[PDB]
Structure formats: C-alpha cells, structure tokens
C-alpha cells in the first residue's frame, strides 16, 4: 500500500529510447521504468520534452528549405 | 475451357497484392 | 497594380497576390495563367488550346510539375535561352504567350523575354584540320573577341583547351556561341553511308524531338532528355544515320558500351566492317575512311595513366578530326575532369543523351555553354497511358526499428549508424516474405543494395546471386543471361553498378534495401530497370516498386529527399504500414532473440651478375 504521483507515458521502443537519452542528460525526466511500452516521467518536464523531442526528430525528416 | 482457365490464370498473374487493395494503416504493423 | 483595393485576406499572400490585374473575356477558352512575379505558369489540360501550348511551353519554359489535370511550368533565362536557339524570336514568344494567356502579360515579363531571346546567333566556332577558328559572319566582332581580356568574315585561331573558358566567357558577354554543322556542304570529312532499316518504327515523340533539332535544317549541339528505357540509344543512331559522317560515342560503362554496338547494328544498316569498339577487352580501331568508335569517358577523360595498347588508340582518336560526338549519360560530363574532353577532342557537333538532367551540385546549368541548351524533354505519365511504358504501383514500406538495435543507434556515430539501421532483422523478414509472394506470382524481382556487405549477407542467407564491382565481366554476363532466360533464377541482387544503363526487358518488380543518401537521380535510374518490362501493354499491367526504409532513422530524411524528383514527374508512392499475411509465412529470418543478439554483435564488431643465383 503505497501511492506515488506521476505521469504515465505510453509509447513505442523508439520513443522509449529517446526518452532515456533525454533522461540520461537530465536525470529527473524518468522516475521509474515500468515496461517496454510504459514509463514514469516528471510532470514538469512533459511540456519541455514534447517540444524539444520534435526538434530532435526533425533531423530524421527532410523539410525542403 | 482450358483457354478460359488460362485467361483466368493470366488475370491472376496480373492482379495486384491484397495490401495494395486497401490502405493498411489501421491494421497491426508488419513484423514477425 | 493601379487603384486596386487590397482584400481583407490579401495579407495571407505576401507580395504574391495577383488580383490587381483583370481577366480577359475569353478566359473560358484560354488555358494559361501567368505569374507576373515568379514566372510560374499554370496550364489547363482540360480546356481548348491545351495541346497547342503543351509543346510551346516545354520549349520556352521548363516543367516543374505536370500532374494529371494542371501542369506547372516556369519561364527562366535558361529556358528562354533554349527556345531562342531553334529559330525563335521575341515576337513569336510574345505573340503566342498573349494569344494563350487569360491575363495580360506584365511589362516585367515582356522585358525578361526580350533580353534573353536576342543573344543567339552571332558568333560561330568552327574547326578545320584539328585547328579551332572562331569564325564570325561580320568583321565588327574582331574588335570584341580579339580585344576581350580572356580571348587572345574575319576568322582567328583559338586554343583548343581554352574552349571551355571562352564558351563560358561568351555566356557573360552579350553573344553566346552556337555550334551549327552544315554537314550537307562538308565534303572534306569522309562520309559514311548508313541508314535506318525498314524494320525501324520511330515513335511519335522521337519524331518530335528530331523535328525540334532539324527544323531549320542545320544540326544544333545540345542535350536530349528522354525517360529511362525510352530509347536514348536509338536517338544517337538516327542522328548518325542522317548526318552520314564519322561519329564517336562515349558511354559510361563497359556493359553499356557492349549494348550500344549491338543496338547500332540491329537498328541501322551500319556494316560491321566500319564499326570498332574501344573497350578494355579489345583495342583494335577501324581502318576505313569513316567509322564508329564507341568508348567510355574513362577511356577519353583519363590523362595520367594510359596503357601502351590504349595509348595508340588515344592517338588514333586524337589524330583524326571527328564529325560527331554522342555523349551518353551527359549528366556526368560537367564533372571536375570529364569536362576536359570537350575541349581536347575535335568535333563539329556535340549531342548529349541522359534520362536525368539533375544532380546534387549547381554545375547542371553549366551544360548550356558546355554542349548547348536542352532541345526536348518528354513526359513520363503521357507515355505510361499510351502504352509506351508500363504503369507502376509505387510503394513505401515503413519497417520499425527493433528495440535492441535502436539502443546502439543513439550512441553510435553517423558513419557506423548507417550499417546499424540498414540490417535490422525486420527488414530481413519482410524481404523474404515479399520475394516468396512475388515469385509465386510469376514476377521477376530486382533487389538493389548500395552496401556490398549487406548484399553478400542477404545473398548468402537466401542463396541468390549478387553482383557488384569486383565481379568479373564474364561471370556477370552468365548471371544476367541465366536470369533473363533461365526460369530457375527469377530474382537477383543488383548493386550500384547496375544502377543505370542495363536493360532487363523481363523485369517487372523492383526492390531497394540500401541507398546512396539523398541523390534523387539514382532513384529514377533504378526505377528504369522495370519501366522497360516485356508486357507493358497487357490489360491491367502494373509494375511494383518497394522501398523498405527503417522508421525513426535518418532514412526518412534521405527517402523523402531522394524521391522528390519522381513526385515532380507524376509518380505517387503508396505508404505500406502493414504487409498483409506476413505473419503466416512458415519461417522468417531472425525470428528469435538469440539470432538478433548474435547478429548485433557480428555487425557491431565490424568497426654482380654471377651473384644473381644467390637471390
Ligand atoms: N523504337 C524502338 N523499337 C523497339 N525497341 C525500342 C525502340 N526504342 C527503344 N527500344 C528499346 O528500349 C530499350 C531501352 O533502350 P536504351 O537505349 O537502353 O534506353 P535508355 O538509354 O534511354 O535507358 C531497349 O530494349 C531497346 O531495344
Ligand atoms: F536511361 Be537508360 F537506362 F540509359
Ligand atoms: Mg542508356
């Protein structure tokens, strides 16, 4: 019997690894690993990872000028 | 009948796969 | 734009709103819209006068996109420079442009057309006895050419090597040079009596391309662009047959050179005695007054190390004054060193043949002063609907990256990252299922892969032949013939070597695993292998092109970047997120984690004369 407030993140392996890399740079991102498709993240960092992660993914997609 | 069968086989040889018939986005992703 | 009130939504168009001008009463008939600022041309293909402009626009305006209904052209200096060459003046362009335009032509557009449509046809470069004379039809030009800082009825000599400099210099100055050959009155050069045999059937677009070249009656130097497999080889044959003079052909491969001679012989009436092949295998040259030498750029552009056997041939080529040069795949001539050939070799006329006239660098525009302007180009979809080329069901398969490999993708460097996401186990499973499914359908499959290591691994894992640079010519020819005529070998594994200029009339399906980053040209050349399929006219025939790409990788950057040219032509790729019936296949490669782990480590680890007897 113990509750822990947080944000449950559901995603795919590829997104999971990206979150880990961001967690490696910023420790507070990930609070605990649940499974291969679920992660616990800090609520405050949600608004920042979502916008920054898109910039990182922008490299994989070619936007013509 | 054989020529009709051959024509049917010829048509089958030219038919496109199933995944081209429908847009397979909603279905589960390909894999093992 | 005078006394035109802006609209409330006019801010959405940043200095691009063209509502200030009025529309003519005959808009319902006139099919053309003209952009007064950027020169963009919107064409109605479902309204009268559409066909009358579909040919005129291609001459004066390059095509940006030509989809089913609304085509998009654009007027530029290069496009106008190409039209002015073939007997066209400013008045003709303006008269036709106004007669077909729904909106009046702006003053800026008129000014642009006037400037670039008056330069052509005042300075001529002639060749005599291997000596280059810049002959001019008026004496006034002497005060210009001889007084130019770069240069040096009146005729004066010019360095053969300096041709590439003066020609570019002529672009900067008002008058550019035109290479017109009056082969009818040229008797000094030995003539060759060859003609197209009756069995030949010149397609309508081929006739149109020739008409644009011989309209005035004098052969013009330039480039002709036709779809892959459209018959660019036959285009050179027709030019040789009508000119009837000594000609030399340069082709960018060893197999392709063997293709050109066989095609020459089959299509025209050139006797074998007058034909000589200059390749690495045999180096004997024709001794007849007039003949044909078919070689490659490497055999004409190499300067440092030429063999003794190949040195005599080079002198043989240089000593004689050729009358015509055919540069197959002219998209490689503007390279750093290949440009040297155009200045060294002597020829009164130059022709360029290439299916793709685009490249990564900006040197493509240099072709104007190197070989000449672009004479004609042909649509892709237009020939597809007329039965000249086969229809294609282009597809793009998204293969998700496996969790194990993707972990190393983050830490690994760019150079090694490529190999990591190109050999993911999921791609192996998809390729095996597709090969089996398409093989039972009676389709000849081609698998492209730029990575040699992946090619061998895939080939050995599936027990299928593979081809790349190290393979000898004899072995590959046997492989090609077996695949062509032997039913046992229904699929092969091509590489960058077979990326272009290899004809496989039986090929119908095409697959590609690896790629050479963002090059859009390689994408078009590879597709050409199946565009010339045998049964391209049977009812409901649709070729297949699969492009397996790893999701969440740099491949999406390269995939969308290397496929932007086909979209312009009209091809549309279908996204395949799921392949139906893939799970029910009995066996799939790397289905268990043990194999995936083993493969991961294997790929990761990749990175006194008497004393002579003594000795
Ligand atoms: N007029 C024609 N009649 C018959 N076959 C033709 C004709 N024009 C082209 N072909 C065929 O088209 C194929 C491709 O020709 P090729 O010159 O290699 O094309 P490209 O150089 O444009 O890729 C060959 O099989 C050739 O015989
Ligand atoms: F465009 Be082809 F294949 F030479
Ligand atoms: Mg060719």
Swiss-Prot record, chain A:
Its main location: nucleus. It is found in: Nucleus. PANTHER family: GENERAL TRANSCRIPTION FACTOR IIH SUBUNIT 5 (PTHR28580:SF1). InterPro entries: TFB5-like_sf, TFIIH_TTDA/Tfb5. Belongs to the TFB5 family. This is General transcription and DNA repair factor IIH subunit TFB5. The gene is TFB5. Pfam families: Tfb5.
From Swiss-Prot, chain B:
TFIIE is a tetramer of two alpha (TFA1) and two beta (TFA2) subunits. Residues 1-12 have a biased composition (Basic and acidic residues). The gene is TFA1. Present with 35900 molecules/cell in log phase SD medium. Recruits TFIIH to the initiation complex and stimulates the RNA polymerase II C-terminal domain kinase and DNA-dependent ATPase activities of TFIIH. Both TFIIH and TFIIE are required for promoter clearance by RNA polymerase. The chain holds residues 275 to 306 of 482 of the full protein. It is found in: Nucleus. Belongs to the TFIIE alpha subunit family. Disulfide bonds: none annotated. Residues 1-21 are annotated as: Disordered. This is Transcription initiation factor IIE subunit alpha. Coiled coil: none annotated.
Curated annotation (Swiss-Prot), chain C:
Its cofactor is Mg(2+). It is found in: Nucleus. The keyword Cell division does not apply. GO terms for molecular function: 3'-5' DNA helicase activity; ATP binding; ATP hydrolysis activity; DNA binding; DNA helicase activity; DNA translocase activity. Belongs to the helicase family. RAD25/XPB subfamily. It comes from the Eukaryota. Present with 825 molecules/cell in log phase SD medium. It catalyses: Couples ATP hydrolysis with the unwinding of duplex DNA by translocating in the 3'-5' direction; ATP + H2O = ADP + phosphate + H(+). InterPro entries: ATP-dep_DNA_Helicase, ERCC3_RAD25_C, Helicase/UvrB_N, Helicase_ATP-bd, Helicase_C-like, P-loop_NTPase, XPB/Ssl2, XPB/Ssl2_N. A motif (DEAH box) lies at residues 328-331. One of its GO terms (cellular component) is cytosol. Residues 429-583 form the Helicase C-terminal domain. This is General transcription and DNA repair factor IIH helicase/translocase subunit XPB/SSL2. Optimum pH is 7.25 for helicase and ATPase activities. Residues 213-375 form the Helicase ATP-binding domain. Keywords: ATP-binding, DNA damage, DNA repair, DNA-binding, Helicase, Hydrolase, Isomerase, Nucleotide-binding, Nucleus, Phosphoprotein, Transcription, Transcription regulation. The modification Phosphoserine is found at residue 592. The gene is SSL2. Its EC number is 5.6.2.4. GO terms for biological process: nucleotide-excision repair; poly(A)+ mRNA export from nucleus; regulation of mitotic recombination; RNA polymerase II promoter clearance; transcription by RNA polymerase II; transcription initiation at RNA polymerase II promoter; transcription open complex formation at RNA polymerase II promoter; transcriptional start site selection at RNA polymerase II promoter. Pfam families: ERCC3_RAD25_C, Helicase_C_3, ResIII. It is an enzyme of class 5 (isomerase). ATP binds at residues 226-233.
